[PDB]
């Protein structure tokens, strides 16, 4: 059983992002350089303006999904348990932590 | 295929169906690129994978081959390569793996049908291997053409019996088939330690009881060891079996009645056991009444504990 180590979970989240990137290339199919400076050691890479927007929007959208999934998990966490007496949200939150330890 | 089989020859029915089954170079890549392909890659390329296509192709071959084929014929060489291609494509169902091994045994290719069981058991998970090991071990011991050495048949059991009880199956028959055949070819009662292992794996009471009958035929020295080991709801049944062994060959039996009644709740069947041991004599209703007195007192002690 066990938890997943940070090497495997980095690998699994790497594979999920590759599969999602693969379906974005599949969906883009269905719907239809390096220059180093001489003066400085600085390096310049030509990019399309697309796929930089697409990465930025994807990182924003994944952040939205994880935010709202945790926010909905917040909603369930403060609506499920009501047996034990508490004082505030942080009481029920800490006594959920003690229930997790059992 | 079916319209052409009636109108034209089965050779015409093969030839239109041969064009379905070209295994081109690599089935692993084509199967995966089809599954990963989002409806763009046709199933024309991965048409070989379909089991339904192979079974009714083969059933034309196995119907068209004569009753005496003897491996000289083209068709028996053709249906064997078409059967072996299904195993190499690995799309073979266990009822279909029996139909090929049965196929070779009718046409006197018995010693190659043991290869057929050998290739496939590895591929299948247990709870299905148990039905192949019955048909494989039975051909080894019963079929008349199979001339396998008695150390080779004993290899086929104790490779299976060790492997198959390791994953964990009751294995009631294989123990008995390794128990029954030991007299017909070897002819000594090594049967017990071969069948003791059924009783002490790591139904089982129904394997232990029939054989402890069997050594009372041979010799009482190897009975009494089992009577000890038999007792070490299910526990109560084992105690009853020990009492029966004592009757066959009485104080040890009564003390055993105590050991069993003390093994576990209810104990009336044990009372039937001691009563049977008393009844077996052709001495005085004194030890018996004393026995019922001891049992009743023990029941009163149990009531006090409760």
């Amino acid at each position: 059983r066990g938890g997943i180590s940070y090497d495997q979970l980095a690998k699994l989240s790497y594979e999920k992002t590759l599969r999602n990137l693969a379906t974005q290339t599949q969906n883009s199919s269905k719907q239809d350089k390096v220059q180093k400076d001489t003066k400085t050691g600085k390096i310049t890479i030509a990019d399309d303006d697309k796929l930089v927007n697409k990465l930025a929007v994807s990182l924003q959208s994944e952040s939205k999904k994880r935010y709202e999934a945790r926010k909905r998990q917040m909603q369930n966490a403060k609506t499920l348990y009501g047996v034990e007496s508490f004082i505030n949200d942080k009481n029920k939150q800490f006594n959920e932590k003690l229930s997790r330890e059992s | 295929a079916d319209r052409e089989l009636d109108k034209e020859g089965v050779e015409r029915a093969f030839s239109i169906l041969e064009d379905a089954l070209h295994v081109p170079t690599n089935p692993e890549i084509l199967l995966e690129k089809y599954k990963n392909g989002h409806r763009k890659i046709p199933a024309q390329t991965v048409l070989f994978n379909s089991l339904r296509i192979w079974s009714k192709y083969i059933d034309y071959l196995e119907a068209y081959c004569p009753k005496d084929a003897n491996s000289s014929d083209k068709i028996f060489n053709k249906t064997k390569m078409a059967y072996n291609t299904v195993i190499d494509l690995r799309l073979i169902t266990p009822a279909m793996a029996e139909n090929f091994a049965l196929f070779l045994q009718n046409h006197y290719e018995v010693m190659e049908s043991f290869q057929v069981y050998e290739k496939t058991i590895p591929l299948f998970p247990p709870e299905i291997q148990y039905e192949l090991w019955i048909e494989y071990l039975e051909v080894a011991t019963s079929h008349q053409l199979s001339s396998l050495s008695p150390e080779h048949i004993r290899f086929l059991f104790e490779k299976a019996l060790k492997n198959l009880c390791s994953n964990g199956i009751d294995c009631k028959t294989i123990f008995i088939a390794y128990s029954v055949f030991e007299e017909r070819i070897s002819g000594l009662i090594s049967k017990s330690i071969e069948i003791l292992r059924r009783g002490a794996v790591i139904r089982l009471q129904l394997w232990r009881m029939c054989i402890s009958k069997a050594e009372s035929t041979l010799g009482p020295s190897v009975t009494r060891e089992l009577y000890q080991e038999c007792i070490q709801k299910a526990v109560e049944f084992v105690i009853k079996f020990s009492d029966f062994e004592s009757s066959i060959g009485a104080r040890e039996i009564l003390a055993y009645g105590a050991k069993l009644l003390p093994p576990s709740n209810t104990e009336l069947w044990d009372s039937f056991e001691i009563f049977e041991l008393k009844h077996g004599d052709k001495t005085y209703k004194d030890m018996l009444k004393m026995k019922k007195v001891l049992e009743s007192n023990m029941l009163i002690d149990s009531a006090s504990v409760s």
Binding site: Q8, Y14, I45 | T25, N26, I29
Partner: protein, 268 residues
């Protein structure tokens, strides 16, 4: 770093990144994602260069057998046996380093042989079992994995030749462990009288009658007696009958020279 440059379709920057990352010897998660990267890019000549380096960074059979699962996925027969020839020589070349176990080298010999069975060359499947057992006489797993290859692909006399050896080693190791199990002797002798006939066949019959006191024991000697008798015999018979016999010696003198050896054995 990778999935951003994957997202920008900069395939030459993830390739330059992976060449550096696999130079620092990080672990099998990096290489396996680097061989999965070239499969995406179809660079078949490049991914074959990786497994050349990947077996040198992680020398173990699950990296070598991963490379033959790569080649047998594509069906190139000329490339697959070249990897198979490189994998089995490196075990032989680097035998003294002791980095592949007995169970570990058995996976290479079996996956070499079962591939050669599918390539219809049974004589190469068969001969490598002999070189591996001789090259390694120590590992029983390669010897036992030799047998399952003969069971599937061999002709019946060859299986019975090899079966007789595994039964020989397994009957030998029980009798060395368990002292007096007289029913395994009456098969272990008949293992050697049936299929092993030779100097060993006579020798065990000495080694058995060494082990022979029970009612359960002494009839085994009766077996060795006739096993000797079917083929000295009087001399061993007097040595065993010494267990004790005044009536026997008087019975012996009246019917030893008078009547036979069978009469002599009747006293025993």
């Amino acid at each position: 770093y990778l999935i951003v440059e994957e997202s920008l379709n900069n395939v030459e920057i993830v390739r330059s990144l992976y060449t550096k990352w696999c130079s620092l010897e990080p672990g099998v998660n990096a290489w396996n994602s680097f061989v999965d990267f070239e499969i995406r890019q179809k660079n078949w000549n490049g991914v074959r260069e990786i497994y050349s380096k990947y077996v040198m960074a992680h020398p173990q059979m699950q990296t070598w057998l991963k490379w033959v699962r790569f080649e047998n996925r594509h069906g190139n027969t000329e490339f697959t046996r070249s990897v198979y020839s490189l994998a089995i020589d490196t075990v032989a070349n680097l035998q003294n380093l002791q980095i592949w176990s007995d169970m570990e080298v058995a996976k290479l010999v079996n996956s070499f042989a079962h591939w050669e069975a599918a390539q219809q060359e049974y004589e190469r499947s068969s001969a490598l079992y002999q070189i591996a057992i001789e090259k390694w006489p120590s590992n029983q797993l390669l010897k036992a994995g030799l047998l399952d290859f003969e069971k599937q692909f061999g002709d019946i006399n060859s299986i019975e030749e090899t079966i007789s050896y595994k039964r020989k080693m397994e009957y030998e190791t029980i009798l060395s462990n368990n002292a007096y199990d007289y029913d395994t002797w009456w098969l272990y002798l008949d293992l050697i009288s049936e299929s092993f006939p030779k100097q060993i066949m006579q020798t065990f019959e000495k080694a058995i009658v060494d082990s022979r006191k029970e009612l359960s024991k002494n009839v085994q000697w009766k077996r060795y007696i006739y096993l000797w008798m079917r083929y000295v015999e009087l001399e061993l018979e007097n040595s065993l009958l010494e267990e004790e016999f005044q009536r026997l010696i008087d019975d012996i003198i009246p019917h030893k020279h008078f009547t036979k050896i069978w009469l002599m054995y009747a006293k025993f």
